[PDB]
Amino acid sequence: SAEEQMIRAFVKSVEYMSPRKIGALVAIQRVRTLQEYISTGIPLDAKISAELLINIFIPNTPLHDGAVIIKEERIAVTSAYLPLTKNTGISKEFGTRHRAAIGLSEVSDALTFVVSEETGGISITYNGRFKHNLTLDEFETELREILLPKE
Amino acid sequence: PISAEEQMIRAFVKSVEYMSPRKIGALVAIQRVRTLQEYISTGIPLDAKISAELLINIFIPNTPLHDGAVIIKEERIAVTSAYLPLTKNTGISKEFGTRHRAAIGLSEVSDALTFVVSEETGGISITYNGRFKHNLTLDEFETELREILL
């Protein structure tokens, strides 16, 4: 349903962005309210579609910097800025988007995924796990495992 | 507080400002009294709050959303990429293109206020009850918007 719509929107958009090496950062509010970092962004309150997500992230456009925040089956804002993890040490492949995805999963139960601006690699942060450089299939399975209940 | 109308004109002006210098084609139609629900069905659903940033991101060329009409209704972007009827009036001439014909076309069959940014010249335009005022300047196009949504 709404999570299944969400997942297909995510997979199709990363499918476009990953080979093109377009940077992307999408955080999905789960139990804990992300409202604090939501307020830092451009309100959209838009329906989730692959097309809108792709348009948001097109390089050097007004909306593509910062995080898209998904709240209750809607793109709540774009251009939100997340807490940075106190680690860095991210040489090649990994960048500030990954650092922000990590720093937010340290203070909430958000599901955040990243497409690397440098390599097009797909990453997910959730719980205390950073799963980096997934395949489109591995990405999609993680999404379903985390977002759909049971099956 | 700022009015949903007022914010929406501010959004329109800022995006045209950005888009017109760069010859970025835009085609935005605002529903008024006559329902545009037939053309709304042909587009990609957004149901998004109106901002200059979203509109600029919608019309960036070679993106999934940019071709066709953004359709405003109840101060939201109902859809993008919608298809409006092209005018059959032969006097439409060149210089103006599909976007302009779609805008003219929709004003023939509805009270909608539509405006256009030419993809080749950057020229701002506006249609409303058949009438078609083109090559406006930012101040022109702005004052026009205000009267219609007074």
Binding site: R8, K12, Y16, A50, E51 | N62, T63, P64, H66
Partner: peptide
């Protein structure tokens, strides 16, 4: 389902 458009 697949996306279409030639922006592709």
């Amino acid at each position: 389902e697949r996306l279409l458009g030639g922006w592709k």
